[PDB]
Amino acid sequence: VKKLINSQISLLIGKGLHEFDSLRDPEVNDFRTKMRQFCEEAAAHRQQLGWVEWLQYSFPLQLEPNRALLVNVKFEGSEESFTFQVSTKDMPLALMACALRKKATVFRQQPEEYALQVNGRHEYLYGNYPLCHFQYICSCLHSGLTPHLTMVHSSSILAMRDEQSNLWSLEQPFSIELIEGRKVNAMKLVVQAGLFHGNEMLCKTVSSSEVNVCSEPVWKQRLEFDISVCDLPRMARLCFALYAVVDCPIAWANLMLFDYKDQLKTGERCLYMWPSVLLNPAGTVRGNPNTESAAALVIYLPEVAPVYFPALEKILELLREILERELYEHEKDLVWKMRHEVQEHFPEALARLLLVTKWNKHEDVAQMLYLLCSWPELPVLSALELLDFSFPDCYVGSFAIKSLRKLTDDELFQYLLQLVQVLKYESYLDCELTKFLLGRALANRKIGHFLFWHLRSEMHVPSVALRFGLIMEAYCRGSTHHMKVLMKQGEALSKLKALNDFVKVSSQKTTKPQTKEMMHMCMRQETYMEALSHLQSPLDPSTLLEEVCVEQCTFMDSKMKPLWIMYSSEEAGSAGNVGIIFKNGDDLRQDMLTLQMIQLMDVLWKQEGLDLRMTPYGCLPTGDRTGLIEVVLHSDTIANIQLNKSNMAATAAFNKDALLNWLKSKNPGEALDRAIEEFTLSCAGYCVATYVLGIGDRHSDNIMIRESGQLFHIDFGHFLGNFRVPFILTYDFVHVIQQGKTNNSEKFERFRGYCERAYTILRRHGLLFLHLFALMRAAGLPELSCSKDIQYLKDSLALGKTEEEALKHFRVKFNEALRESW
């Protein structure tokens, strides 16, 4: 019945749906019901899409940001296949017609009714794009393999779609009654509070009277705040901090002064507080659900009788350029004076205007919101700024989502990590961002995939557990089939957790080979073989993890014993030979963010025609200190290469030549030049990427080389110079760039040219990183917690410099890095 979906969702999110009901909360109850009906509307629209439109849902195109190639094509009900000489500039339609003419001769007797599936994968090639503009063809051309595609008819694609179906009057000062506590401490107890509107204060922070660590301490004091009640903004947020004194932080707690129906909150409130590292504005406005052992304040918010926030209709009724590109009071007031001409001539400066409006005075808010509701939509870049906690107001928030609707699915994917973390800054469950992310997730299954996992990865955190569970529950109402697909993934990871816990215990007692043999026995059980096999990869749902290749599975010797899990496929061939690494015990978010930013750098470089040959490999947290990492096969560490062990192809007279002999052995004869280029390009990319991102602790063990020449980085424990990390040039890579010559300035200075181009391209999108890192502060990443972390980026890119000045400064750091190389 309905009941089976509920128990499946419950298992899928790690939080039973009985628990949502047991709160008796009207906001939860109205989120669930209102978002259920919204996601079910999507699910209906989804099942009546056309077959091409369904491919757009299920397998959205992997596109890149003349010349010949072999393509091998087959038809779905056949092993008999054909090979074709085609051009890289031809459409899929041209190729599909080629296939049908070779079939109509072999079988002796329309291209529009087909889609090319990438063999043994959930990737499809269709639409009016040249072959080399598809990521599969482009990947294939660099790596050198023949494409393997399959003609899938529309009736068979529709068969897939089928089987997935489901007010101003009050001028008194705002005040409270601080009643009492119920907590523990080692002195006297002070309760400082404050009215914040985002980061900014609506008035100074009024303390409570000092009182002894008496219980369960009692106060029964008025606190009177320096602000009229009519001047409270819609997102007025009252923020407490309980600490002790003769500073000693103990707890904190926030709540919105207006409830989710716009009503002002009266009367009594028990705030269940959270422990501390004093006053914490951006902290969540929901209480600690650990009600048993939580320090709890009770307070009263005076009755003033039922007063709702004014409806929008009521609100709407009620030297200049030189600065506009931190400002002084007169400059702020000149920016406010000319607010109408900001709307008319400089609409991209909305943010700076929003940071000069007095949010603690209500006429100014209406005068602002009046400008805001006719304000033209801004570019995607500008809207990512307005999502930050710096702009808490709902109309500004709702305006931002309105300017972000024109995000492409690829862009939305690009920023999905950051957008999810902004859900933590949200004050209420039902919000324009949630609905936006949910509606786009339900319109694109890849977006839907990754939204699920970004949320599912944080259910171990009580502050977001309720929000995230509910969103996940809503998504599942709107995609029964993808729920089941994801359960299969989660069942795989449950088994990997249990197999990894075995491997840890075992490794501490017996030898490496005997633990590996005993891992393989455990995997060869029905329950494991079934669970570990025949799923989609959480790292990339278009990757199919088919036959778990137990022989080649192992574990790595590092402290947490990450498992090495290899998968094969009959239908896919070499594309089906894929590896994943399950790591349990480490917080992979730090890594994931670092790889996504390098991926973005790659995207931004390719958009200016620069292909530095990066390796943007999957990294995805899936659970508490648990996640997956995509295996880049056919690669080894600089450490393992430079070991220089004998009876190998890299038998080297000098350790400087170990890499170059290694590259030689893997790329013999004419192909050595192609790999040194791959190496050089990739070396330059990661050199810049590490310098901008401030990635420290780089040694041979955590730098890998692919057998193509491509270099890339692993293990991102520290970033943004969290030990001012300088540019890193390594002699043995310099040796490879220079083709093993001691003096080869032409090949070396090309590499400086690549590094400089790469560095100047990121400086132009400096604001994109600044905005995206600003939104990431929401995550509570230990090394992304303050302004000096964001200042690192500003200084690494040199964002307040002229392009000429910054390039001069970059070349100092580069020449310094060159000197350091021996």
Token pair 């891992």 is found at 519
Cβ nearer to ligand FGE, comparing 571 with 636: 636
Stretch that binds ligand FGE, among 543-551, 556-564, 656-664, 812-820 (CB under 6 A): 556-564
Shortest CB 582 distance to ligand FGE, Å = 9
Beta strand ranges found along 661-761 (DSSP E)? 703-706, 711-713
Cβ nearer to ligand FGE, comparing 415 with 617: 617
How far from 820 is each of 98, 731, 811, CA to CA, in Å? 58, 9, 14
Helix axes 2-13, 462-477, angle to 10 degrees: 140
Contact pattern for ligand FGE over residues 645 through 684, marking x by CB under 6 A: ----------------------------------------
Give, as ranges, the residues between 711 and 730 that touch ligand FGE (CB under 6 A). 714-715
| Contact between 62 and 123 (Cβ < 8 Å) | yes
Give, as ranges, the residues between 124 and 163 that touch ligand FGE (CB under 6 A). none
Cβ nearer to ligand FGE, comparing 180 with 587: 587
Tokens of 625: 């200190």
Cβ nearer to ligand FGE, comparing 299 with 695: 695
Cβ nearer to ligand FGE, comparing 187 with 633: 633
Give, as ranges, the residues between 572 and 611 that touch ligand FGE (CB under 6 A). 581, 583, 591
Q: Which of 681, 683, 652 has its CA nearest to residue 665? A: 652
Give CA torsion, residues 798, 804, 808, 809, to 10 deg: -10
Could you tell me which residues come within 8 angstroms of residue 742 by beta carbon, excluding any fewer than 6 positions away? none
Query: Binding-site residue total for ligand FGE (CB under 6 A)?
Result: 16
C-alpha to C-alpha distance for 230 and 239, rounded to whole angstroms: 19
Cβ nearer to ligand FGE, comparing 715 with 756: 715
Cβ nearer to ligand FGE, comparing 630 with 657: 630
Shortest CB 132 distance to ligand FGE, Å = 26
C-alpha to C-alpha distance for 514 and 506, rounded to whole angstroms: 9
Cβ nearer to ligand FGE, comparing 558 with 607: 558
Q: Does 487 bind ligand FGE (CB under 6 A)?
A: no
Shortest CB 715 distance to ligand FGE, Å = 5
Tokens of 419: 């957008």
Shortest CB 564 distance to ligand FGE, Å = 8
H helices of 175-305, where?
A: none
- Residue by residue, DSSP assigns 526-553 as HHHHHHHSSEEETTEEEEEE-EE-TTT-
79 CB-contact burial (10 Å; exposed 0-12 / middle 13-18 / buried 19+): exposed
Tokens of 446: 């890849």
Cβ nearer to ligand FGE, comparing 434 with 599: 599
Residue 500, classed as helix, strand or coil, is: helix
Cβ nearer to ligand FGE, comparing 373 with 649: 649
Q: Which of 627, 565, 564, 559 has its CA nearest to residue 591? A: 627
Cβ nearer to ligand FGE, comparing 190 with 503: 503
Shortest CB 41 distance to ligand FGE, Å = 40
Cβ nearer to ligand FGE, comparing 301 with 553: 553
Cβ nearer to ligand FGE, comparing 311 with 639: 639
| Partners of 712 in beta bridges | 704
Token pair 């790329």 is found at 667
Shortest CB 787 distance to ligand FGE, Å = 28
Cβ nearer to ligand FGE, comparing 561 with 771: 561
| Partners of 191 in beta bridges | 242
Shortest CB 702 distance to ligand FGE, Å = 8
Q: Which of 770, 778, 810, 773 has its CA nearest to residue 454? A: 778
The single-letter code of the amino acid at 671 is A
| Contact between 394 and 234 (Cβ < 8 Å) | yes
H helices of 17-131, where?
A: 18-21, 26-47, 51-58, 92-106
Q: Does 448 bind ligand FGE (CB under 6 A)?
A: no
Cβ nearer to ligand FGE, comparing 324 with 602: 602
Shortest CB 817 distance to ligand FGE, Å = 24
Cβ nearer to ligand FGE, comparing 139 with 228: 139
The backbone torsions φ and ψ at residue 720, rounded to the nearest 5 degrees and listed phi first, read 60, 40
Shortest CB 631 distance to ligand FGE, Å = 5
Shortest CB 648 distance to ligand FGE, Å = 16
Stretch that binds ligand FGE, among 20-28, 317-325, 554-562, 691-699 (CB under 6 A): 554-562
| Partners of 564 in beta bridges | 554, 581
Q: What is the DSSP letter of 258?
A: B
Cβ nearer to ligand FGE, comparing 90 with 715: 715
The single-letter code of the amino acid at 459 is M
Shortest CB 704 distance to ligand FGE, Å = 6
H helices of 69-166, where?
A: 92-106, 135-143, 154-162
| Contact between 71 and 84 (Cβ < 8 Å) | yes
Shortest CB 105 distance to ligand FGE, Å = 44
Shortest CB 712 distance to ligand FGE, Å = 8
Cβ nearer to ligand FGE, comparing 273 with 711: 711
| Contact between 591 and 584 (Cβ < 8 Å) | no
Give, as ranges, the residues between 73 and 132 that touch ligand FGE (CB under 6 A). none
C-alpha to C-alpha distance for 62 and 127, rounded to whole angstroms: 12
C-alpha to C-alpha distance for 422 and 401, rounded to whole angstroms: 12
Tokens of 739: 């083709």
User: 21-29, long-range: CB within 8 Å, 24+ apart, which pairs?
Assistant: 26/260, 27/259, 27/260, 27/428, 27/429, 27/430, 28/429, 28/466, 28/470
Q: Does 617 bind ligand FGE (CB under 6 A)?
A: yes
Q: Are strands 578-584 and 626-630 parallel, antiparallel or unpaired?
A: antiparallel
Tokens of 150: 């399959």
Token pair 């809503």 is found at 474
Shortest CB 493 distance to ligand FGE, Å = 15
Shortest CB 619 distance to ligand FGE, Å = 6
Give, as ranges, the residues between 619 and 638 that touch ligand FGE (CB under 6 A). 629-633, 635
Could you tell me which residues come within 8 angstroms of residue 182 by beta carbon, excluding any fewer than 6 positions away? 215, 216, 295, 296
Q: Does 558 bind ligand FGE (CB under 6 A)?
A: yes
Shortest CB 765 distance to ligand FGE, Å = 25
Shortest CB 709 distance to ligand FGE, Å = 15
Contact pattern for ligand FGE over residues 372 through 411, marking x by CB under 6 A: ----------------------------------------
Residues in the chain: 822
Shortest CB 735 distance to ligand FGE, Å = 23
Q: Does 556 bind ligand FGE (CB under 6 A)?
A: yes
Q: By the criterion CB under 6 A, which residues form the site for ligand FGE?
A: 556, 558, 562, 581, 583, 591, 617, 629-633, 635, 704, 714-715
